[PDB]
Scaffold this active site. Sequence first.
Site, PDB file in Angstrom:
ATOM      1  N   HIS A   1      46.347 -21.251  82.285  1.00 28.28           N
ATOM      2  CA  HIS A   1      45.802 -21.583  83.586  1.00 28.28           C
ATOM      3  C   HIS A   1      46.561 -21.493  84.893  1.00 28.28           C
ATOM      4  O   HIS A   1      46.052 -20.088  85.706  1.00 28.28           O
ATOM      5  CB  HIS A   1      45.821 -23.526  83.550  1.00 28.28           C
ATOM      6  CG  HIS A   1      44.913 -23.927  82.579  1.00 28.28           C
ATOM      7  ND1 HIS A   1      44.823 -25.919  82.771  1.00 28.28           N
ATOM      8  CD2 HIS A   1      44.572 -23.737  81.699  1.00 28.28           C
ATOM      9  CE1 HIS A   1      44.404 -25.689  81.502  1.00 28.28           C
ATOM     10  NE2 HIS A   1      42.948 -24.036  81.095  1.00 28.28           N
TER      11      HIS A   1
ATOM     12  N   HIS B   1      35.121 -23.717  82.310  1.00 28.83           N
ATOM     13  CA  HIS B   1      36.466 -23.132  81.893  1.00 28.83           C
ATOM     14  C   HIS B   1      37.004 -22.289  80.849  1.00 28.83           C
ATOM     15  O   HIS B   1      37.863 -21.590  80.803  1.00 28.83           O
ATOM     16  CB  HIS B   1      37.518 -24.466  81.423  1.00 28.83           C
ATOM     17  CG  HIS B   1      38.772 -24.824  81.006  1.00 28.83           C
ATOM     18  ND1 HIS B   1      39.617 -25.310  81.916  1.00 28.83           N
ATOM     19  CD2 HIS B   1      39.371 -24.301  79.641  1.00 28.83           C
ATOM     20  CE1 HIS B   1      40.409 -24.781  81.492  1.00 28.83           C
ATOM     21  NE2 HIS B   1      40.420 -24.847  80.067  1.00 28.83           N
TER      22      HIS B   1
ATOM     23  N   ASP C   1      40.060 -19.498  81.207  1.00 26.89           N
ATOM     24  CA  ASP C   1      41.019 -19.551  79.969  1.00 26.89           C
ATOM     25  C   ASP C   1      41.031 -18.258  79.675  1.00 26.89           C
ATOM     26  O   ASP C   1      42.253 -17.433  79.364  1.00 26.89           O
ATOM     27  CB  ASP C   1      40.691 -20.220  78.360  1.00 26.89           C
ATOM     28  CG  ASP C   1      41.137 -21.882  79.162  1.00 26.89           C
ATOM     29  OD1 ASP C   1      42.797 -21.936  79.121  1.00 26.89           O
ATOM     30  OD2 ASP C   1      40.863 -22.821  77.511  1.00 26.89           O
TER      31      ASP C   1
ATOM     32  N   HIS D   1      41.745 -19.116  72.921  1.00 25.71           N
ATOM     33  CA  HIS D   1      42.408 -18.335  73.033  1.00 25.71           C
ATOM     34  C   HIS D   1      43.269 -17.436  71.315  1.00 25.71           C
ATOM     35  O   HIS D   1      43.544 -16.202  71.605  1.00 25.71           O
ATOM     36  CB  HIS D   1      43.865 -19.597  72.937  1.00 25.71           C
ATOM     37  CG  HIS D   1      43.814 -20.393  74.134  1.00 25.71           C
ATOM     38  ND1 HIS D   1      43.875 -19.952  75.464  1.00 25.71           N
ATOM     39  CD2 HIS D   1      43.624 -21.721  74.607  1.00 25.71           C
ATOM     40  CE1 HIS D   1      43.583 -21.198  76.284  1.00 25.71           C
ATOM     41  NE2 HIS D   1      43.888 -22.109  75.819  1.00 25.71           N
TER      42      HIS D   1
HETATM   43  C1  LIG Z   1      39.679 -41.727  73.434  1.00 20.32           C
HETATM   44  C2  LIG Z   1      39.788 -40.353  73.547  1.00 20.32           C
HETATM   45  C3  LIG Z   1      41.343 -39.617  74.456  1.00 20.32           C
HETATM   46  C4  LIG Z   1      41.880 -39.305  75.631  1.00 20.32           C
HETATM   47  C5  LIG Z   1      42.910 -37.878  75.358  1.00 20.32           C
HETATM   48  C6  LIG Z   1      42.793 -36.584  75.450  1.00 20.32           C
HETATM   49  C7  LIG Z   1      43.263 -35.487  73.961  1.00 20.32           C
HETATM   50  C8  LIG Z   1      43.650 -34.055  74.764  1.00 20.32           C
HETATM   51  C9  LIG Z   1      43.459 -32.662  74.262  1.00 20.32           C
HETATM   52  C10 LIG Z   1      44.105 -31.827  74.482  1.00 20.32           C
HETATM   53  C11 LIG Z   1      42.664 -30.182  74.866  1.00 20.32           C
HETATM   54  C12 LIG Z   1      42.754 -28.744  73.837  1.00 20.32           C
HETATM   55  C13 LIG Z   1      41.504 -28.302  74.785  1.00 20.32           C
HETATM   56  C14 LIG Z   1      41.956 -27.912  75.672  1.00 20.32           C
HETATM   57  C15 LIG Z   1      42.427 -26.018  75.848  1.00 20.32           C
HETATM   58  C16 LIG Z   1      43.274 -25.212  77.553  1.00 20.32           C
HETATM   59  O1  LIG Z   1      43.387 -26.459  78.454  1.00 20.32           O
HETATM   60  O2  LIG Z   1      43.312 -23.723  77.412  1.00 20.32           O
END
Ligand SMILES: CCCCCCCCCCCCCCCC(=O)O
Lengths: 267, 267
Positions: free
Chosen positions: B73, B225, B229, B252
């Site tokens: 980000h 998003h 990314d 990624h």
């Molecule tokens: C009931 C559920 C819960 C809340 C917790 C969320 C879990 C965390 C997930 C992490 C996200 C990973 C993917 C995103 C990657 C990025 O931003 O580049």
Amino acid sequence: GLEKTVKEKLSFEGVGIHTGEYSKLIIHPEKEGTGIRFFKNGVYIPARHEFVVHTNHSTDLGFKGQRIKTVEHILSVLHLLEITNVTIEVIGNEIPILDGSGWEFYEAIRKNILNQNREIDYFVVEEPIIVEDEGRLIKAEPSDTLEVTYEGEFKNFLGRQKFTFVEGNEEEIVLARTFAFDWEIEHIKKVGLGKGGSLKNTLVLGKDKVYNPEGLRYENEPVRHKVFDLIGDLYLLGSPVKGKFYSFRGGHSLNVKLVKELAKKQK
Amino acid sequence: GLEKTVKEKLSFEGVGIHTGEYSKLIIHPEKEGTGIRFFKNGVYIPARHEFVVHTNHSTDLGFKGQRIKTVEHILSVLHLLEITNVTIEVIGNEIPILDGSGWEFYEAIRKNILNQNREIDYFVVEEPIIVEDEGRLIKAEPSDTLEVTYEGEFKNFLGRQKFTFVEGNEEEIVLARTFAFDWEIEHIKKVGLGKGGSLKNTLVLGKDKVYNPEGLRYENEPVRHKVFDLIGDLYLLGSPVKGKFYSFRGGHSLNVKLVKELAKKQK
Ligand SMILES: CCCCCCCCCCCCCCCC(=O)O
Ligand SMILES: CCCCCCCCCCCCCCCC(=O)O
């Protein structure tokens, strides 16, 4: 047993599960015959069914414009420990959720118990009674001791399981956390609740999985908590209880209903 | 365009999405020709593919025993704003997740842009290239401008949607948050990640519902998003990029793969 109370002031603090707001507790010791009552904004609210203003996904109490959300756990422990005269000062609008169980309270209250010269006047269930509400049912009959059973008919992998509490088995339920299914979270947040919920304070169950990485403490942790809930709710009769309760798919709402229709019998 | 940098020190702080730990950022201004590099424990880590040590659900960088998690980000924004010479000081092990988008950085960096006397030496994609990895594919060809498209084949209610970014449309993707479906939040937490995740920083999608009570910002927020990314990832070529990219079900992992197999062509 004799009426009990705390040796000295005890305090607890943390986020409220529904409001998502911070709040603090300060348990004050009270003279004999006092009873359990909360204290908010210079207003005393008795831990009695008359002051119940909400039974959705928590048991809320209120009086003269002052409300406290989620009193079940704190009450349940006080009920298990048979602590009868105390004042729960609340600086906020809801008892803190802590780890989602009654563990922290129990462990801390147990230490500071102070015996008193006055035989507890228990609330005895004198004769059979039942309450329904669409599939949901609770049965309560007379008993020398406190005995509560909860049976669940869970839609997910849990299936049909039930647990039974009997005096001397407190440590078996003061550790069960609060639970919610995934198909159980959107709705709650939408009707303005669970603002404080998280996997650290709540145990989230999937259609056939457990989100929390910490897994389940007990195979039937959910059913246990429901028993914990009921006990604390039952303490709204105004004094330790003595009866045999059967709850099938119960919930605070029905819980209170019973209590009210159980005291309305001037018992 | 001319090389850019910040007018003065800018700082940000908050929980890391994966580590669940607190960390602080301090963006330092740097002389011309410096480039983008992070600074951790007296160690400078260049925002270049060579220092990529993890591409699971974030792009991590490291050097001589120092690691920074989730740099996509922060880099993506710097890439959108064409900020070329700065030093990102990290006090922790991962760039803070903030609201889950690049919004906060953008809004703050945009103010303090400082032009410099030196024409940016863009990284030009000179000729077609493709990379696969089981269904997942990215296609990159030559282009006068920066143009990136991401197409998703979501298993849930989202279905098949795609978005396309072109220069002058930054505000259209710097606001898209990070997302995850309910099916595997478990997995993620189990492989030791997402310790910082919450509905306040992450947008959780169900098989056919949206847990966050705040709903989706854009009908296709997720796809956006993913484009955000990719852009940030692409900045690991060591300088603003100029090409036309097509990513179908990217991530990624594949992103970096491309970048590496795209620079390995001494381009
Ligand atoms: C009931 C559920 C819960 C809340 C917790 C969320 C879990 C965390 C997930 C992490 C996200 C990973 C993917 C995103 C990657 C990025 O931003 O580049
Ligand atoms: C980090 C991830 C989060 C998801 C948060 C879970 C939402 C909270 C749900 C509230 C539980 C409702 C059931 C009430 C039982 C009780 O009295 O304890």
